[PDB]
Amino acid sequence: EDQKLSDFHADMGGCESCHADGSPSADGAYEFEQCQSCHGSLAEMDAVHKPHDGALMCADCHAPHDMNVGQKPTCDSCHDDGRTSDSVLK
Ligand code: HEC
Ligand code: HEC
Ligand code: HEC
Ligand code: HEC
Ligand SMILES: O=[P-]([O-])[O-]
């Protein structure tokens, strides 16, 4: 099976690469700060990412314990109008 995104990161840097005291925060804010410490901000990302700057945390799409390395978030998790990744090109 492909590895979970959480475990892929834990192999590099442990659970504490994302979690303070290794325990999850109530709101995901700490974790989101950690994603950005290594990845930077949505403001500097591509056409699917940048429109979400100010609306979402990375984990809202890339749910690390539930999604695998390489797994593409699908837009139907939140938008009901049938848009897909190519919709930002049109
Ligand atoms: C960043 C890439 C992460 C790593 C590395 C680990 N976790 Fe995590 N975890 C992360 C997020 C963003 C969230 C919350 C959002 C979500 O999709 O759940 C979590 C959540 C947990 C939880 C709560 C689980 C739940 O209530 O469903 C636990 C107990 C947790 N994480 C533990 C954990 C451990 C032990 C890790 C090292 C093996 C670990 N996480 C890595 C982000 C990341
Ligand atoms: C630094 C300590 C990091 C933290 C905190 C988070 N990420 Fe990360 N991520 C990091 C690196 C160096 C890499 C590339 C590693 C490699 O060997 O390729 C990544 C990769 C991802 C990926 C892509 C996985 C793939 O498909 O190959 C995603 C989607 C990703 N990271 C998301 C992510 C999120 C949502 C985080 C916070 C919850 C997060 N990362 C934390 C370094 C670090
Ligand atoms: C949902 C609106 C998303 C949010 C919020 C974030 N990401 Fe994302 N990411 C998303 C999609 C749909 C895709 C796939 C794009 C495609 O069609 O290929 C991605 C891809 C990444 C990747 C690349 C993974 C790879 O294949 O190499 C990385 C590294 C990644 N996303 C990281 C990332 C981070 C760090 C975010 C918060 C700053 C973040 N994403 C938010 C959808 C969404
Ligand atoms: C929930 C985790 C989401 C997923 C998955 C995707 N999007 Fe999203 N998107 C989301 C929110 C909460 C918002 C803000 C909406 C608001 O009313 O402020 C957005 C916004 C966009 C936008 C910008 C506004 C718009 O023109 O609709 C675009 C272009 C957009 N989203 C596209 C999009 C695509 C193509 C996705 C799949 C790759 C996608 N979103 C996933 C929440 C979520
Ligand atoms: O190798 P394990 O993190 O799936």
UniProtKB/TrEMBL annotation:
Source domain of life: Bacteria
Record's subcellular location: Periplasm
Every Tetrahaem cytochrome domain range: 8-80
Residues bound to heme c 4: 52, 75, 78-79, 83
Cofactor requirement: heme c
One CC-aspect GO term: periplasmic space
Residues reported to bind heme c 2: 15, 18-19, 65
Positions with a binding annotation for heme c 1: 9, 35, 38-39, 70
GO molecular function: metal ion binding
Keyword line: Electron transport, Heme, Iron, Metal-binding, Periplasm, Signal, Transport
Main location: periplasm
Binding site for heme c 3: 49, 58, 61-62
Protein name, per record: Cytochrome c
Gene name as annotated: cctA_2
First-to-last residue of the parent protein present: 26 to 115 of 115
